[PDB]
Amino acid sequence: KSPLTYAEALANTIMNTYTVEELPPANRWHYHQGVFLCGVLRLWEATGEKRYFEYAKAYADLLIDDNGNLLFRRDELDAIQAGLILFPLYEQTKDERYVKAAKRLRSLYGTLNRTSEGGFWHKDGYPYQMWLNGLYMGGPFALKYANLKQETELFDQVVLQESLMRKHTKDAKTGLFYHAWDEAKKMPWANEETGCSPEFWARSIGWYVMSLADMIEELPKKHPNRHVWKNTLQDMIKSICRYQDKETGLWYQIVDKGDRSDNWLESSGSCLYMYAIAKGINKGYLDRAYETTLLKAYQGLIQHKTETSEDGAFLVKDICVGTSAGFYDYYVSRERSTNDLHGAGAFILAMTELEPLFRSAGK
Numbered sequence: 001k002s003p004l005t006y007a008e009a010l011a012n013t014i015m016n017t018y019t020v021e022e023l024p025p026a027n028r029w030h031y032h033q034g035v036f037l038c039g040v041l042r043l044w045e046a047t048g049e050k051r052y053f054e055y056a057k058a059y060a061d062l063l064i065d066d067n068g069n070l071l072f073r074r075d076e077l078d079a080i081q082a083g084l085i086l087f088p089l090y091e092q093t094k095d096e097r098y099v100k101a102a103k104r105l106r107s108l109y110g111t112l113n114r115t116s117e118g119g120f121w122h123k124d125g126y127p128y129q130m131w132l133n134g135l136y137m138g139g140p141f142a143l144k145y146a147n148l149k150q151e152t153e154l155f156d157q158v159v160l161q162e163s164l165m166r167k168h169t170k171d172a173k174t175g176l177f178y179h180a181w182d183e184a185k186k187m188p189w190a191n192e193e194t195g196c197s198p199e200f201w202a203r204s205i206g207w208y209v210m211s212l213a214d215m216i217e218e219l220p221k222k223h224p225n226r227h228v229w230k231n232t233l234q235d236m237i238k239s240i241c242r243y244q245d246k247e248t249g250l251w252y253q254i255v256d257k258g259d260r261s262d263n264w265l266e267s268s269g270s271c272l273y274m275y276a277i278a279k280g281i282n283k284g285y286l287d288r289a290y291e292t293t294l295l296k297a298y299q300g301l302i303q304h305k306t307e308t309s310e311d312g313a314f315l316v317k318d319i320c321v322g323t324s325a326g327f328y329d330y331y332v333s334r335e336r337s338t339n340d341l342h343g344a345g346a347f348i349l350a351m352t353e354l355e356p357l358f359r360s361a362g363k
């Protein structure tokens with residue numbers, strides 16, 4: 001029941017399930033594998049087991065050639081996320097192929113379309129729409145690159161993107177942030193007055209809090225946002241925990257509507273909150289009192305969402321598949337999948353930040 005034990009169990013199950021050539025979407029550079037591999041590389045640093053490092057490197061090498069060339073969806077913030085695996089790979093090998101690949105992804109920022117205030121469109125196919133998920137897809141990578149190449153322009157970039165998102169999607173009443181915002185107000189889900197989508201979808205908010213929790217330490221010392229983001233995170237975590245499931249300790253697909261019978265407890269979102277809370281506590285951004293909420297979620301997660309198959313495979317169920325911006329009925333109707341990379345990555349990542357607290361609990 002130690003966090004890392006489950007993390008390795010799930011990691012090995014996924015790796016045994018897919019060769020790096022099969023890791024879905026097969027032979028594509030995408031954030032599905034990106035988040036899972038970020039988890040795998042984090043587990044590597046925590047255990048020192050070379051095969052976690054080698055598996056991640058295998059996927060990178062399948063897509064990045066001898067000259068650092070990489071094929072990717074050029075209009076999506078989503079394409080940048082996997083770039084996060086390039087930093088630990090480069091730091092360990094010093095192979096310039098990874099820095100060259102990272103530069104191709106970093107060069108995308110200047111080619112992307114933006115809203116009138118400068119917020120990146122989530123994709124070319126989603127004109128003038130900012131989705132919370134985008135903060136994680138393009139934020140952390142930008143800061144990691146900023147520190148690697150001493151390009152301060154990227155600090156301002158992330159600060160702007162984050163402020164624009166919070167400004168347009170944060171709900172005063174609940175403290176939760178709406179999934180998406182359409183400056184053009186052309187999408188059917190765009191509120192005629194605010195331009196926001198109608199629901200608080202767990203994972204989207206989860207991507208946001210994990211981002212804040214990880215990006216604070218990347219900012220230069222004394223940076224104005226070290227305090228802005230810490231405070232934003234405290235308020236969001238406070239808001240989020242107000243909706244934790246009293247019985248299971250988990251969170252619902254649609255955060256603020258757990259009473260509805262068509263709603264349900266979703267795994268990846270819960271894990272992302274667990275990660276942000278654990279991370280926040282370890283870095284001193286959140287009151288250590290949150291440890292109980294965290295350990296309660298861990299208990300419910302393992303108890304209600306995990307099991308081992310007759311064959312010995314560790315399974316995490318109720319992970320929502322890739323999802324777009326929409327209405328309530330669309331969100332609750334999303335396919336629930338077992339070991340979907342969205343959830344596997346979130347699960348493993350959460351276990352790596354949880355472990356430390358788990359071992360110092362009571363001290």
Ligand SMILES: C[C@@H]1O[C@@H](O)[C@H](O[C@H]2OC(C(=O)O)=C[C@H](O)[C@H]2O)[C@H](O)[C@H]1O
Nearest residue numbers: 078133134137203204321322323324342
């Ligand atoms: C190409 C597919 O586009 C969407 O269906 C999904 O990606 C979106 O949803 C999510 C998510 O966390 O569910 C994250 C991305 O930021 C967003 O673009 C699929 O995952 C994509 O494969």
